Structures are given as C-alpha cells and as structure tokens.
C-alpha cells in the first residue's frame, strides 16, 4: 500500500490521500511547541525555543512580517523563512501599492494558495512547517493556523508542535476567560504561558528558552526574548 | 531540457556516480608524477590490448595546458579531452585579463571546480577522470605537482600516481622518495619515475613515456631510446646484486 503511493506529491492513494503532504505534516508534530491566543484588543504568540546542545542557542521561532503582523513556526525552519518572507512581501506590496495594511484574513488566503501549488505539481515538495499567524488589522485581533496542506484556519487560540495537544485542550477550556482579557497584555501573555506549559514534560520554560510576541490596538508586533520574558516565568 | 539528478546521496552518505567514476579511473592506464628540486617529471604507461597503432598521430597522455603547465590523467580518454580544452581556454582567458599566466594551483583549482560541478548538476554524470597537473608558476623555480579526482577534490604531492596498480607504485614512491633530499637532478628524477613504473608496466620500453618539465616553459618529452636507456641502467642495478 502506502509505499506505492507516497513517492511524490502528485499521486493520490487508493483512498484519496496525499502521503507526501501527510509526511510533511509529520515534521510539524516533531517540532517544538508554540501557542497562540487572542482577546479583542490583542493577540499573543508564545513559543518554546529548542536547543541542540547546552552549548548551542535556542532557535528563534517567531518572525515579524510587518508592524501589524507576525507568526510562530513549528517544523522546518528554512520553510518558515521562505513563507514568512513571501508574507513580508505581500504586506509590503499592499502598503506600497494601496497604502493599505494587509488583512490577516487575506494573508491567510495568500499562504494557503502558495502552499497548495507545491502539492499538485511534480518536482516540488510540500512545505514542512506549521505556522501560527497573529495580527491586528481593520477588524481587530486575529489568529490563524497554517498547515502545509494549505489549510489555514482562524481561531481564538491554538497550538502546534510536540505535545501541542495539552495547551490546546487548556485553551479550549480557558476560552470564555482569556477571550475577554481586553486592554491588559500582561494577562493575555500569562494566559499564554500557562497554556504552553500545559505541553511541557521535559523541562520548564527558562529565560533563554521562552519566546513571546504580541500585537494589538496600540501595540506594534514586537518580540520578547530572554530577560524580557523573565517577568513571566 | 534533461536535468535528472544522476549524482545523489545514498543512505550511507555516498554518491555512487562519483564513486563509480573513481572505478573508471582505477581501470585507466597508470600515471605518475614526481617533483625534483628543479623539475617535475610525468610518466604514463601504454596499454597493449591492441598493438599496431600509429604512434605519430595517436593522442599522447601528457597534455600542455599552457607553455609552462602540463596535465596527465587516468580514466576515460574522451572525458579528459573536455577537461583539457576547458583548462586551455581558462589559461588564455587568465593571461588576457590578469596579464599573467596561471599558477599551477590556480589552474588545478579550476579543473577541480569543473569536476565538482559535474557532481551536483542535473542531467550530467561526473568525469571518469583523475589528473596530475605540474609545472612552474610564472617567474618561479619551485616545482608544482597537483592531483584532482572526480569528486572535485585536489591537493599537491611530492610525488603521486593514479590509475591501475597505482597502489603498488605509490608504495614504491612512499619508500623511495625522501622529502629531505628530492631528486636533485633531472636525471635522477626521471630515473625514480621509470623505476616506479617498472614495478607495474612489466618490461615496456615502448609502454612507458616520460615528459620533463623545467622552469620557464621548458617542457620536453623523452624518446623511446632516452627512456629505454634508463630502463637498461635500471635492470643492471638489480642484476649487480
């Protein structure tokens, strides 16, 4: 079975599956955990940075795409660089040509389509990374989840990566609570750190290990790392 | 149009097409090069699968890239022509833009680059060739000897050999070549070269050609006699014991 239909992205299995896409999705699951959640005034990204050795650094997982948009990655870093770079350009085009900040919903559609092209053609490969996009546009705070399959969804909160399931159930529970953390960023962040720690097991989020990013009403997308996150551990 | 990835990694981390390219080299006639104190000598063996050739016209094994540098090889003959032509062109281009002929390392680095490139470009197989490049940098008297292989790897040697039975002849050189006192003469250098080839050519006066390269574009190939004379003096060193 499978082995005969997972050679490339241009092949359907007898049941209508695309194994190369599914294998790419597997790279995400193997990726470190990251969480996203938003209220009505802000959107926050909390990500667990993974390190190779105790002599190495903890690879960044948050990329700023514009003053009002940014994302967190889980999986192949290079593929995140490519996708976020495409996003940086689309945000850029919107400003330069239309003097308009790109709507998060549109950014999601653009990403979906860019990934879809690498799943119907020969020679290419699906992207092997998941992305969580947060942003504040003309319709408030937003959070999107991007999957290499090309599927992008808008949520109040979510998480991807290894053991992401923990943090996700927590948010699905804490929903009515954080969705109302309006006008108070520190609370939204704390609510995020709490959701993320619901996926810990190995260790505990340290200073050079935790990474947070926020954007909102009067807050340009900014990333906090190290000492800057100390007050949240 | 054709761009199939022919040279790719295998589970153990090998690139079989480059590896098999080396096997084509092992199969080629042997070539050796030893550097004296004031020269570099290049020796090659001559197959005998078919003998009735016209030596005058049949393409020789040692090729001049420029007036001060030569290149010999072991492997596919057809492939070697491609590398030699590109080397000759690069040599002229270099003189044209730098107003100075190429150094032996530069020319080696170029040939090697071409070889490497053919190991990771679509639609092409690696060169089944390994080369020995020797000569003297412009206005320099210090001898130069380099070796390149299919992978694109290159380095300089006091003396080296490539091709069939190069294992045997390298052993000879490793226990017959002293970096402390390199063949201080064109003569004793050519002798050490012939001796090394005899370890595998198995009596072949017409099966061993040699070329001597001295500073300032002084390059000459020995004739059958001149060589045959060295063989003679060599077989006596043995019998006189």
């Amino acid at each position: 079975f499978r082995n005969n239909y997972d050679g490339d992205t241009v092949t359907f299995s007898p049941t209508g599956r695309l194994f190369q896409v599914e294998y790419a999705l597997e790279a995400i699951k193997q990726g470190s955990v990251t969480v996203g959640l938003r209220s009505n005034t802000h959107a926050v990204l909390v990500a667990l940075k993974r390190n190779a050795d105790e002599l190495s650094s903890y690879q960044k997982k948050i990329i700023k795409c514009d003053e009002h948009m940014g994302l967190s990655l889980a999986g192949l870093a290079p593929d995140a660089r490519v996708l976020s770079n495409y996003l940086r350009q689309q945000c850029n085009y919107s400003s330069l040509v239309f003097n308009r900040k790109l709507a998060v919903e549109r950014a999601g559609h653009l990403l979906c389509d860019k990934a879809q092209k690498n799943t119907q053609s020969y020679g290419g490969r699906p992207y092997g990374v998941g992305l969580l996009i947060i942003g504040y546009d003309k319709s408030g705070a937003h959070l999107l989840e991007f999957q290499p399959s090309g599927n992008v969804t808008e949520l109040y909160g979510t998480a991807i990566g290894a053991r992401s399931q923990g943090a996700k159930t927590y948010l699905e529970r804490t929903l009515d609570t954080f969705i109302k953390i309006d006008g108070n960023p520190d609370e939204l962040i704390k609510a995020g750190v709490e959701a993320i720690s619901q996926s810990l097991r190995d260790e505990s989020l340290t200073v050079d290990n935790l990474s947070i990013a926020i954007v909102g009403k009067d807050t340009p997308f900014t990333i906090y790392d190290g000492e800057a996150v100390a007050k949240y551990i | 149009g054709y761009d199939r990835a022919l040279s790719i990694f295998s589970p153990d981390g090998h690139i079989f097409q480059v590896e098999y390219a080396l096997e084509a080299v092992k199969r080629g006639t042997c070539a050796v090069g030893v550097k004296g104190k004031n020269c570099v000598v290049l020796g090659c063996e001559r197959r005998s699968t078919l003998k009735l050739q016209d030596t005058r016209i049949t393409p020789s094994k040692v090729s001049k890239i420029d007036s001060h540098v030569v290149l010999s090889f072991s492997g596919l003959n057809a492939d070697s022509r491609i590398l030699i032509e590109k080397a000759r062109v690069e040599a002229q281009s270099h003189r044209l833009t730098l107003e100075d002929p190429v150094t032996v390392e530069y020319l080696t680095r170029y040939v090697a680059g071409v070889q490497q490139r053919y190991t990771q470009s679509g639609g092409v197989r690696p060169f089944g060739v390994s080369t020995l490049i020797a000569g003297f940098d412009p206005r320099d008297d210090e001898p130069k000897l380099y070796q390149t292989e299919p992978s694109g790897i290159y380095s300089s040697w006091s003396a080296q050999t490539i091709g069939r039975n190069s294992k045997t002849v390298r052993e000879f050189l490793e226990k017959n070549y002293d970096r402390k006192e390199p063949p201080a003469t064109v003569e004793e250098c050519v002798k050490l070269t012939v001796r090394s080839l005899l370890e595998v050519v198995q009596t072949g006066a017409k099966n061993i050609e040699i070329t001597v390269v001295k500073p300032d574009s002084d390059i000459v190939a020995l004739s059958s006699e001149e060589i045959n004379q060295y063989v003679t003096q060599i077989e006596q060193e043995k019998q006189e014991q």
Partner: protein
C-alpha cells in the same frame, strides 16, 4: 499487469484513469455541500464542521464568489478548491475584458471544465481533489452546475457532493418532484438549510456551522450575496424544526 494507477494520465486496461477515481475518494471524504436552482436564481449551502470551540464562528467562509454574479462551493481538498476559483476569476476577468459583458454561466462552466480536464492529461500534475457546485444568473436565466475531478460537468436542477451526498440527493429529488412549477429563492434558502441539516447525520458526531449564499434576479438583483442575520436564522430554525 498492474501499476496503471500510479501515474495520472494512464488508461487502465478497462479504459479508466484510476488517479481521477482516487481523487473522487478525497471528495467523498469531504464535508457535504449543495446547490439548488430556483425560479430566478440559485442557492448554495455547505456544512462547516466545528473542529472545536476555538474556531471563531462565521469566520472561515467557504463559499466563494467569482466576478460579481457567480457563486462557488466545493467538497474535498479545500486548497484545490481555492486554486480552481482563482483560475475561474482570471478566466472571468479575461472574458469580460475582451467581450465587455460579464461571463455567461455556461461559458464559465466550460472554462472550469477545460482547466480541470487538462489536469487529467499529464502525469506531471495531479487531478483536482474537489467536486465543485457553482452557478449564477445571466442574460438568460439561472444556471446550476457541478464539476467532477474528471472535468465532467452538467447543468443541474439540484446538486450535492461530499459525505452526505446521498441524503441530499434524496431530498433534492423530492423537491424536484413536488415542485414541477419551480421553487422560489426565499423557499430554496430554507430548503437548503434543511437538506444540510438532514445530510449532517452522516457526520452527526461533530457539531457544525451552516453557510448559505444565493443569487436571484429579484432577491439580489442578479448579484451573488451571502445569507446573513435574520434571513439566516429564519432558515436555521426552519431546519431545526423539521429535524424533529
């Protein structure tokens, strides 16, 4: 022998294109969606499975508009659906640019038809993993269409595809029989909300969200528009009521 199903444009010994057939499987494994042709327009409805409470309600819209008078909904691999609509949009823009008049539904159907059929001609591409229901109003009436992964399409009175296509088709057939004179846009919207509810039993495990859109010469002036607020709830209720 075998292996006729490993490459896209290959004919099997019985004259079939197995990869297209496997594409269909991906479609039948998708959410259910339908289309209903009324006396002066068409209605589109689709099931939206609520994976979790985290999904912001009403935000992940599935029905897509082409030009200003055409609606498109599909079941299967969503990204493939978007891809096909993007093509339809370029295709419609091109037709309007040269002929001035917005593209007629039949003409539009073939543009999608040919493009989809094209993806069954080479092994360098994969067939589309979606069946698409689309249509709208034009110079001479309303038109409803359904396009399969093979590039096959026909005009329909009613149409359904996805997990609960059988339930839907059953319901649609009843409507067709009990209304030879023709349903109205207002009626079709409710009837559509009902069928989506009924057809949701083949997935009754997960909760869902209803989405309707329509294009009626009288109700929307021939422009494709989404059903929202009061008209939406009124249809939701009409379903919830007949689901018991």
């Amino acid at each position: 022998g075998t292996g006729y199903d490993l490459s896209n444009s290959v004919f099997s010994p019985d004259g079939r294109n197995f990869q297209v057939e496997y594409a269909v499987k991906a479609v039948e494994n998708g959410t259910t969606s339908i289309g209903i042709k009324c006396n002066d327009g068409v209605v589109f409805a689709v099931e939206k499975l609520i994976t979790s409470k985290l999904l912001v309600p009403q935000k992940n819209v599935k029905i897509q508009v082409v030009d200003r008078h055409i609606g498109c909904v599909y079941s299967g691999l969503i990204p493939d659906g978007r891809h096909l609509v993007n093509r339809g949009r370029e295709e419609a823009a091109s037709f309007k640019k040269l002929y001035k008049t917005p593209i007629p539904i039949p003409a539009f159907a073939d543009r999608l038809g040919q493009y989809v059929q094209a993806h069954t001609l080479y092994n360098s591409v994969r067939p589309f993993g979606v069946s698409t229901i689309f249509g709208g109003v034009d110079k001479n009436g309303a038109h409803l269409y359904m396009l399969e992964p093979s590039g096959s399409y026909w005009g329909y009175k009613g149409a359904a595809t996805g997990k609960g296509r059988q339930s839907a088709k059953a319901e649609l057939e009843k409507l067709v029989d009990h209304h030879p004179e023709g349903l109205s846009a207002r009626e079709a919207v409710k009837q559509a909300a009902k069928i989506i509810y009924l057809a949701h039993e083949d997935n009754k495990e997960k909760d869902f969200e209803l989405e309707i859109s329509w294009c009626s010469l009288s109700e929307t002036n021939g422009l494709h528009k989404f059903v929202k607020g009061d008209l939406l709830q009124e249809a939701i209720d009409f379903a919830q009521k007949e689901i018991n």
